[PDB]
Each structure stands twice: as C-alpha cells, then as structure tokens.
Design an enzyme around this catalytic site. Structure first.
Site, PDB file in Angstrom:
ATOM      1  N   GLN A  82       0.099  -1.322  -3.224  1.00 23.15           N
ATOM      2  CA  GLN A  82      -1.184  -0.720  -2.794  1.00 23.15           C
ATOM      3  C   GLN A  82      -1.622  -1.439  -1.525  1.00 23.15           C
ATOM      4  OE1 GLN A  82      -3.024  -1.299  -6.871  1.00 23.15           O
ATOM      5  NE2 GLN A  82      -2.796   0.948  -6.791  1.00 23.15           N
ATOM      6  N   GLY A  88      -6.291   1.079  -2.876  1.00 20.23           N
ATOM      7  CA  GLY A  88      -6.681   0.351  -4.072  1.00 20.23           C
ATOM      8  C   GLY A  88      -6.453  -1.148  -4.082  1.00 20.23           C
ATOM      9  N   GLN A  89      -6.020  -1.730  -2.976  1.00 22.29           N
ATOM     10  CA  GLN A  89      -5.774  -3.150  -2.930  1.00 22.29           C
ATOM     11  C   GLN A  89      -7.035  -3.925  -3.295  1.00 22.29           C
ATOM     12  OE1 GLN A  89      -4.849  -4.726   0.970  1.00 22.29           O
ATOM     13  NE2 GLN A  89      -3.406  -6.165   0.113  1.00 22.29           N
ATOM     14  N   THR A  90      -6.979  -4.773  -4.328  1.00 25.52           N
ATOM     15  CA  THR A  90      -8.129  -5.612  -4.677  1.00 25.52           C
ATOM     16  C   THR A  90      -7.899  -6.991  -4.033  1.00 25.52           C
ATOM     17  OG1 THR A  90      -7.351  -6.279  -6.934  1.00 25.52           O
ATOM     18  CG2 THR A  90      -8.653  -4.305  -6.731  1.00 25.52           C
ATOM     19  N   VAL A  91      -6.751  -7.627  -4.256  1.00 19.45           N
ATOM     20  CA  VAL A  91      -6.523  -8.926  -3.626  1.00 19.45           C
ATOM     21  C   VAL A  91      -5.852  -8.718  -2.251  1.00 19.45           C
ATOM     22  CG1 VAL A  91      -4.805  -9.224  -5.445  1.00 19.45           C
ATOM     23  CG2 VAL A  91      -5.157 -11.078  -3.853  1.00 19.45           C
ATOM     24  N   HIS A  93      -3.746  -9.661  -0.224  1.00 20.88           N
ATOM     25  CA  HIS A  93      -2.465 -10.352  -0.046  1.00 20.88           C
ATOM     26  C   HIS A  93      -1.469  -9.215  -0.400  1.00 20.88           C
ATOM     27  CE1 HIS A  93       0.780 -13.191  -0.302  1.00 20.88           C
ATOM     28  NE2 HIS A  93       0.023 -14.263  -0.453  1.00 20.88           N
ATOM     29  N   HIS A  95       1.452  -7.460  -1.992  1.00 26.51           N
ATOM     30  CA  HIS A  95       2.206  -7.715  -3.206  1.00 26.51           C
ATOM     31  C   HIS A  95       2.711  -6.450  -3.852  1.00 26.51           C
ATOM     32  CE1 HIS A  95      -1.929  -7.328  -4.665  1.00 26.51           C
ATOM     33  NE2 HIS A  95      -1.399  -6.867  -5.779  1.00 26.51           N
ATOM     34  N   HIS A  97       3.782  -4.495  -7.314  1.00 32.28           N
ATOM     35  CA  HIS A  97       3.653  -4.464  -8.770  1.00 32.28           C
ATOM     36  C   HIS A  97       5.025  -3.960  -9.257  1.00 32.28           C
ATOM     37  CE1 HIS A  97      -0.824  -4.686  -8.847  1.00 32.28           C
ATOM     38  NE2 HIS A  97      -0.713  -4.048  -7.699  1.00 32.28           N
TER      39      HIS A  97
END
Ligand SMILES: OC[C@H]1O[C@](O)(CO)[C@@H](O)[C@@H]1O
Ligand SMILES: OC[C@H]1O[C@](O)(CO)[C@@H](O)[C@@H]1O
Lengths: 126, 126
Positions: A82, A88-91, A93, A95, A97
């Site tokens: 994301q 929808g990226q929350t953090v 950084h 990454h 999933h």
C-alpha cells in the site's frame, strides 16, 4: 534496533535481515503467517527506493513468502504494497504485506508469542 | 508476441519491455491506469522466478507505478500480486497489478482504445 516508520522494532520479532532489508512478524496478523518485508532504510514511497533496494526487497519477499506459506500451511500467497496515503498506507515506511492463503480463508498476541513465532521462522533461513 | 498464460498479447497493448519483463494495459482496468507488470517467462508461481527475474520484475514495476500515477493523476499506488489459486490468481502467469489511487476512489474498452492508452504510456519511457 530496526526502524519501521517512527517505531523501533525489537530484534526478537525480526526473523530475517539482509544487507538491505528485514522481515518481521505482526502484533495482529490479518491471517496466520501475515508478515512484513521492509527495506532497512525508512523511505515513505516505493519510488524513493534505489534499484538495489528494490531488488533486495523483493528477492527477500520471495524467500519469506516461500517460508511462511510452508510454515503456516498455505497453498498460495497474497503480496500487497500500500504505497501512499490514498492506497491505505498507515506507517510511512515502504513495506510488503505477505499473507499465506488457504482454501476458504482479536488476532492480537503478546510480544512473547510474536518472538516465539519469529524464532520458528528463523529456523527456515539457517 | 508476448505470452500471458495461454494468450498472446499484441505489442500494441504493451507499453514497456525490458530484458526480463514487460508491462501491458488491461481490457477492463479496475481503476483508470490499472496496468500489469509480468516477467517475459511464463511461470505460474512467484517462487518459480529466478533472482534476476525478481529484481527486474519489481524494478520495472517501480518505474511503471511512477508513470501511471503521474499520467492518470493518482496520489498513491496499490501494488498486488495474487500468487496462486487460493490468492485469486486467474491467469497462471506471475504478474503484478499496479493501480493509481486517488482520494475517495463496464470499464471495458476496445483494443484500439487500449492501444491508444499504451501509446500514451510509452511516451514516458522514451
Ligand atoms: O503456525 C503454524 C504452525 O503451528 C501448527 O499448526 C501447530 O504446531 C504447525 O504445524 C505449523 O507449523
Ligand atoms: O488517462 C488520464 C489522461 O486523460 C486526461 O484526464 C484527459 O486527457 C489527462 O490529463 C490524463 O493524462
């Protein structure tokens, strides 16, 4: 001793570290075996990564997917990144999933259970 | 002249080709700008790809994401690989879905409109 946005991740929950990336287990995995693969350098958007970091991130993601699919008895895998606030990226950084998938497929656990899960996963990379 | 599972993809709808990968536009993009990045070698599962193909697939995916986000006016990107039957893979060829995302975000089109879209996208890789 691994950054993930603005938090430090204890080594106990990291099961793979390469020259440019690392993989960790989740506090609330969406499915059993739901893990994350991240570059060691904390960049926010995928376009920020250098080519070597892109290659490393995904070659690592490939190895991790194989391991988690095996360990958690999945028969497929969902890989999702994301990239950005509207995705929808929350953090903040980059990454990936990685989620083992089974036919026909709260989850919160203690740090100790996360560390136990990471220890099981390291065995596959020895 | 590009394989994608058991179908041949006309060059007219392919907007990027590297030494190991290629990118194409969709008949029914889920969102405008929804494109696919695939290795040239038709393997079914992600673990089947060689490391060089893994690096190439994703470095190409990175370049394509930047281009489509720009062209279709997205502010983020969703990257997803449905690796296997239980992850939803319909075409048995490894491929990454790249989707430009906008705040608050049938689609069928003619081959000619797909070819026009691919021609617009090639301009960004000149
Ligand atoms: O987390 C999945 C792991 O737990 C079990 O279901 C029980 O030990 C295993 O066979 C598997 O490896
Ligand atoms: O497909 C998106 C493209 O179409 C427009 O909305 C109209 O020409 C453009 O500005 C954009 O580049």
């Amino acid at each position: 001793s691994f950054r993930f946005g603005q938090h430090l991740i204890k080594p106990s929950v990291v099961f793979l570290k390469t020259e440019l990336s690392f993989a960790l287990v989740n506090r609330k995995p969406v499915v059993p075996g739901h893990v994350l693969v991240c570059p060691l350098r904390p960049v926010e958007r995928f376009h920020d990564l250098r080519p070597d970091e892109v290659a490393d991130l995904f070659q690592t993601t490939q190895r991790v997917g194989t391991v988690v699919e095996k360990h958690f008895h999945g028969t497929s895998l969902t890989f999702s990144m994301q990239d950005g606030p509207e995705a929808g990226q929350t953090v903040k950084h980059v990454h990936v999933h990685v989620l083992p998938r089974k036919a026909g497929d709260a989850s919160w656990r203690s740090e100790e259970e996360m560390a136990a899960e990471a220890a099981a996963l390291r065995v596959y990379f020895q």
